[PDB]
Amino acid sequence: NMEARNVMSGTWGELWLDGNKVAEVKKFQAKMEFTKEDIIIAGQMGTDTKYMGYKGKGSITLYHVSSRMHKLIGEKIKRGSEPRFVAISKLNDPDSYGAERIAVKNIAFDDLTLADWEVGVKGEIEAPFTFTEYDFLDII
Amino acid sequence: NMEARNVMSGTWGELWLDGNKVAEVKKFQAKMEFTKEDIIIAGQMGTDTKYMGYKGKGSITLYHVSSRMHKLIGEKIKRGSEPRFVAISKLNDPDSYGAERIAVKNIAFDDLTLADWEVGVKGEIEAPFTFTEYDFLDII
Amino acid sequence: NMEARNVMSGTWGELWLDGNKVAEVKKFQAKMEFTKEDIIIAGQMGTDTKYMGYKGKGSITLYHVSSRMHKLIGEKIKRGSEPRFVAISKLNDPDSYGAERIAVKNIAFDDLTLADWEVGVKGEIEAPFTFTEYDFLDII
Amino acid sequence: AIGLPSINISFKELATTVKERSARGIIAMVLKDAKALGLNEIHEKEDIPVDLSAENKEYINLALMGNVNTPNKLLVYVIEGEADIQTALDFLETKEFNYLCMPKAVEADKTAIKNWIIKLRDIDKVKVKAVLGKVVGNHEGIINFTTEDVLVGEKKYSVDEFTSRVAGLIAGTPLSQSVTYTKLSDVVDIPKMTKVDAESRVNKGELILIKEAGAIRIARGVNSLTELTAEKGEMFQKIKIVDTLDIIHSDIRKVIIDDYIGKVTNSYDNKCLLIVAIKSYLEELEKSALIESDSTVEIDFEAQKSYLKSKGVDLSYMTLQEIKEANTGSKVFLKAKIKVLDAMEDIDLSIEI
Amino acid sequence: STVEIDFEAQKSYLKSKGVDLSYMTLQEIKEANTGSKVFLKAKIKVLDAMEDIDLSIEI
Amino acid sequence: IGLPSINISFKELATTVKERSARGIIAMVLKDAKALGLNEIHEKEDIPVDLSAENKE
Amino acid sequence: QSVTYTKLSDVVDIPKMTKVDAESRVNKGELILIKEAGAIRIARGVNSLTELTAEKGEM
Amino acid sequence: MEMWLRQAEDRFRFPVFPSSFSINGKAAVNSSSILKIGEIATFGGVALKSISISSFFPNKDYTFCDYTGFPSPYDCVNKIEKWMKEGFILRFTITETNINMEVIIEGFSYEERDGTRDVYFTLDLKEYKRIKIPKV
Amino acid sequence: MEMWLRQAEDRFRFPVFPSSFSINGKAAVNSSSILKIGEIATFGGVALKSISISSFFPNKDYTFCDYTGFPSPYDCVNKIEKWMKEGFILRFTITETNINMEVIIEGFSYEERDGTRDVYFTLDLKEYKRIKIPKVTP
């Protein structure tokens, strides 16, 4: 059976980035994509597939209250190292069955925003990334 | 002769995925697409076609109340095996002529969503797939 | 802990272009984009990335009150020289923690607008650019 | 105890054939000995019990040989000479197997085995078979092997002694083939018989060895059944057809018992789930050359109508959809259509000029 | 499933107590005082698991 | 109520009879020594065994 | 679920019984052990009630 | 349709049927030029057919496989490589067509290119004709 | 899997496994002809295999590296260049496959093409065979 109260509300999400709580988070995405190859056989009308590999993609959106991302990246990209990060997301709605905690590991960001403002508009930051592996801490 | 009452409402649909009832389903699609080749003959103005093959496509949409897709997939993709699934969809409107029950077989999912939440928004999951064959159990 | 008052409002931004204050500024953007290369290894399912380089992009928007851009560029482009510019942006919301001041250096503009008017519409100017490096003067 | 590093070498025989994985290929043999006195499961040659007579060892070795695959397993029940065959039969009723053979059997023993097979197959609905020498069984469950002398190597085997080899032969061939014209490399020569003799024996429902096309092989793969009715057509005279039917029966029974009996409530949706599972198994059989390409599984409408009428429900007021989805109380009715393939055994040539 | 006041039992009890049941409306009988007794009735339905299967195959 | 019954039967293919109709009732008046009075015939197989062969035809 | 046809892995052997005897015992209202499908399992999940009235019923 | 390569009683059946197959045939034509009339030509003989196959050997039991029970990918590779090494005369047949002839292996290339451990291959075959030496 | 190039006891293991690898094999078929019959063919022996490898030598420790402790890119370049120059006989192996044979290096090219100081390379190897020497009869 399903109750309307059991649908998870996104207001009850939390995010940890590099071990520090991010109180100004707005949304969080993380998704694994699978690569397929089409199989076609002479004399058969149907078409089938086989899995080739997988890749990870996601993004983060924050309210602009401080220079968190510049401190996080700093000069690491400029100097030529390869910074990687770990993020932890939690979704714990009191009316749902339970919690859901996932660790997203080996994160590489796509860009860095220095300034983005306009008169009469409140500021926000968007930050896409890619990753390679994940772990489930709490399941529901 | 047709009546307005005979149009099937989508609120009366039901879905079974790998033998388990899914009470949080939102919509279900399944379609077969045919491939054609154009035939052109010198000296004639008209253009004709012949069939070449077919392919299956579809998708599912769910309310986010639990981690059903992760438990269904598990480590099967990561470990390199090739998992396949069976889905059964039923549409039984009391005001229609009868029921319509289809079995969709050899399903391969396209991606896996780990986290997708935003403050002030209720959660949903979307899961596209491809399949190879189908059976009809009840015809209206 | 986060407060609603700590979100920076864009009405409090300021811009200096080649050492002269620009009072008619409407919005300012500046972003660094990183280039990635996919790494695929035979016998492993996962796909990884490595950084290759970076590039800078941005734009400015102004109210049309004078011919600032034409005087700034002049004949430098026509005569075949390569002009470059320095821009400094400040964001200082009284309700926030502090100020954020960035210097954007080695700016090359993308185009020049000579006339763009329409009856019953107030005029605006848009100026995209690219840059190579930046410095941080005040960190919030 | 931890010792010095070493190399351990063991030697084994190279067999080209590979053991068959299916539930078929399990052969049950009954041999009377005064020493072992028990049941043993023989998976290979190295685990044959010691202190068993060399004669019974030769019978076991004959059974272990297969046609294209080796037998999956062997069940040997050792019985005292004074002990009755009925005790062995009663013990064997519980176990599962494909074929039964008894290298040493008197006419009374043969008729007891025949009656047991008939009773088990027809009354108790258990699919088992036996290979016997010079027994007129007139039943699909009895294989009648009538060849008096078989000379292999340097010794002569009687009609009853070679039934172990015959049972291994039948259990070693795949179901896509048929045992007809299978040749035995071990056999050296056999008593001479004319062509009309062999034809007359085959018409009587006997499995015989013949010399044809420069080799020694079996004539045709038929069982003991000779008289045909409307219910049992000519297709029930073939070993391959009956074997395929028994495989289908056993597999569907296994699926039903494992996944549905007593674990699932009796509603229409669960009936649909069961139908899907059975159709999946039938398609698995279709991909192999065992059955034809188009098969169907459905709800049995007439049976449900009869059950509802017997219970006393008024069927006139309800509609067909309501008849289909009515509650039946722990009972399910289904129907299916299949067509079973046969191996090619004759050629008809129409030659033009 | 349904749950409902048992009208027949209450009517029989009132008759047994000797009250004059004539010239009484149905609502009057339904809401009549019945001492310390309560009469109710209900209806439910329960299912059973699969235990017998018939599969007829045509060859 | 006995043991759980799981029986799988094999039989030959049977002919398909023609479909029924929701309208059309026929009344026939016959003369035979036995099987008197009204009779109801829904399916072709069900004819009284007492009747003569000509009446059955 | 129901306990019909649930197999006991720990049990290794039971005394011999025929199909007719087991069927008669189940008809008399007994819960027994049986050998079936290569294991030992409960034949049926019935209790000892054998006399049925108009209101009691088979359920 | 099925694809077989057989050496006497030793037979091998390909587990995944390819996406396409094509047979190539040619004939030789001899040309001469004659004064004031131009070019002329005559028949000169037919050449040997050739056929190329591309597919892969699967590392697991797929749904689209032709049958079940085939060997490991490198077992197939080793068997075909031995056949090419010794120069055996083989018989190649595609069922439901007119392709049934004796051949010899000219080339064999194999590779791995993803995370599945499947082995993709390309096989080149050439028609074989024996020469008849007359006697008296 | 792993990739190794070994000269006697001097072993080298590639830090980054390539994106793909392929073995090329051929057999020599002699062509002739017969009057009024057309073309005929005969078997002329097997040829030596060949393989080509493409990857890069990392200038830093990556998450996708096979192991830690490998040398600098130009040390690897110098080693392979010396082996190619002197014409050494080497053993080439890819684990979990059937590739294990003696080779000789035919070509080696390397380049730099971005800001990471990684060195991309292409290596061409050819199989090597030995002939038995005759022995005087007793």
H/E stretch holding D119 reads helix D107-122
Residues 6+ apart with CB under 8 A from D207: D143, D144, D145, D146, D166, D218, D219, D220, D221, D222, D223
- Please tell me which residue of chain H has the smallest CA distance to C42: H114
Residues 6+ apart with CB under 8 A from H107: H122, H123, H124, I24, I25, I26, I27
* CA distance linking residue D64 with residue D19, whole number of Å: 10
* CA distance linking residue H119 with residue H73, whole number of Å: 6
Helix pair D163-172, D54-64: axis angle to 10 deg: 20
* CA distance linking residue A30 with residue A131, whole number of Å: 9
Contact state of I98 with H74 under an 8 Å Cβ cutoff: yes
Q: Can you read off the two tokens belonging to residue C113?
A: 């607008």
I19 at C interface, C-beta within 8 A: yes
**Experimental method for this entry?**
cryo-EM
User: Could you tell me how many residues make up chain G?
Assistant: 59
CA distances from residue D288 to C95, D279, D292, D322, H72 in whole angstroms, order as listed: 76, 15, 9, 38, 21
B101 at D interface, C-beta within 8 A: yes
- Please tell me which residue of chain I has the smallest CA distance to C40: I19
Q: Can you read off the two tokens belonging to residue B23?
A: 């009470």
A9 at C interface, C-beta within 8 A: no
* CA distance linking residue H120 with residue H110, whole number of Å: 5
HSE (CB half, 13 Å, CA atoms) of D265? 7
* CA distance linking residue G31 with residue G4, whole number of Å: 10
F49: how many CB neighbours lie within 10 A of its CB? 6
Amino acid B55 reads K
Resolution to one decimal, Å: 2.9
> From the candidates F1, F5, F6, F13, which should be mutated to test the interface with D, based on the most D CB atoms within 10 A?
F6
A and I in touch (3+ CB pairs within 8 angstroms): yes
The answer to whether residues B99 and B23 touch, using CB atoms and an 8 Å cutoff, is no
To the nearest 10°, report the CA torsion of G10, G15, G19, G20.
-140
H/E stretch holding I2 reads none
* CA distance linking residue D129 with residue D132, whole number of Å: 10
Please give the angle made by the CA atoms of D223, D229 and D230, to the nearest 5 degrees: 125
Residues β-bridged to residue I5: I12, I92
* CA distance linking residue D318 with residue D303, whole number of Å: 16
Helix pair D85-94, D107-122: axis angle to 10 deg: 30
Q: Can you read off the two tokens belonging to residue I81?
A: 């260049």
D20 vs chain B: nearest CA distance in angstroms? 25
Sign, CA dihedral I73-I74-I78-I84, equals: positive
Secondary structure class of D285 (helix, strand, coil): helix
C7 at A interface, C-beta within 8 A: yes
HSE (CB half, 13 Å, CA atoms) of C109? 19
Q: Can you read off the two tokens belonging to residue E9?
A: 């039992």
Which chain E residues touch F11 with a CB distance below 8 Å? Answer: 56-59
Which chain C residues touch I116 with a CB distance below 8 Å? Answer: 50-52
Residues 6+ apart with CB under 8 A from D254: G37
The answer to whether residues A32 and A56 touch, using CB atoms and an 8 Å cutoff, is yes
To the nearest 10°, report the CA torsion of C49, C52, C53, C55.
-60
Amino acid D169 reads L
Please give the angle made by the CA atoms of C44, C47 and C49, to the nearest 5 degrees: 135
Residue-wise DSSP of F5-34: -EEEEEE---PPPPPP-SS---------SS
The answer to whether residues C118 and C91 touch, using CB atoms and an 8 Å cutoff, is no
Indicate the pairing of strand D26-32 with strand D73-79. parallel
> Any idea what DSSP says for residue D323?
H
A47 at I interface, C-beta within 8 A: no
> Any idea what DSSP says for residue D241?
H
Size of interface D-F (CB pairs under 8 A): 17
Sign, CA dihedral D89-D91-D93-D99, equals: negative
I21 at C interface, C-beta within 8 A: yes
Q: Can you read off the two tokens belonging to residue D269?
A: 């949706």
* CA distance linking residue D78 with residue D53, whole number of Å: 12
User: Judging by beta carbons within 10 Å of its beta carbon (0-12, 13-18, 19+), is residue A126 exposed, middle or buried?
Assistant: middle
A48 at H interface, C-beta within 8 A: yes
A132 vs chain B: nearest CA distance in angstroms? 11
* CA distance linking residue D267 with residue D322, whole number of Å: 13
The answer to whether residues D285 and D291 touch, using CB atoms and an 8 Å cutoff, is yes
The answer to whether residues D201 and D146 touch, using CB atoms and an 8 Å cutoff, is yes
Residues 6+ apart with CB under 8 A from F29: none
* C-alpha closest to that of F33 among F46, F47, F54, F52: F52
Amino acid I8 reads A
* CA distance linking residue A8 with residue I2, whole number of Å: 46
The answer to whether residues H127 and H26 touch, using CB atoms and an 8 Å cutoff, is no
Contact state of H18 with A42 under an 8 Å Cβ cutoff: yes
H/E stretch holding G23 reads helix G19-27
C104 at A interface, C-beta within 8 A: yes
The answer to whether residues I26 and I43 touch, using CB atoms and an 8 Å cutoff, is no
Sign, CA dihedral I31-I34-I38-I43, equals: negative
* CA distance linking residue D16 with residue D18, whole number of Å: 7
* C-alpha closest to that of F51 among F42, F41, F17: F41
Closest partner CB to E49 (pick from D235, D245, D264) = D264
H/E stretch holding D195 reads helix D195-203
Question: Which chains, if any, share at least 3 CB pairs under 8 A with chain B?
Answer: A, C, D, H
A81 vs chain I: nearest CA distance in angstroms? 8
Contact state of E47 with D300 under an 8 Å Cβ cutoff: no
- E strand spans, I3-131: 3-7, 10-13, 21-34, 38-46, 50-57, 90-94, 99-111, 119-127
* CA distance linking residue H43 with residue H29, whole number of Å: 5
Amino acid C86 reads V
I34: how many CB neighbours lie within 10 A of its CB? 12
Which chain A residues touch C54 with a CB distance below 8 Å? Answer: 77-78
Composition of chain I by helix, strand, coil, percent to 5: 10, 50, 40
* CA distance linking residue I67 with residue I61, whole number of Å: 9
Which residue's entry shows tokens 């990687």?
A84
> Any idea what DSSP says for residue C9?
B
The answer to whether residues C63 and C26 touch, using CB atoms and an 8 Å cutoff, is yes
Closest partner CB to D272 (pick from B88, B98, B105) = B88
What SS3 string covers chain A? CCCHHHCCEHHHEEEEECCEECCCEEEEEEEEEEEEEEEECCCCCCEEEEEEEEEEEEEEEEECCCCHHHHHHCCHHHHCCCCCEEEEEEECCCCCCCCEEEEEEEEEECEEEEEEEECCCECEEEEEEEECEEEEEECC
The answer to whether residues A14 and A90 touch, using CB atoms and an 8 Å cutoff, is yes
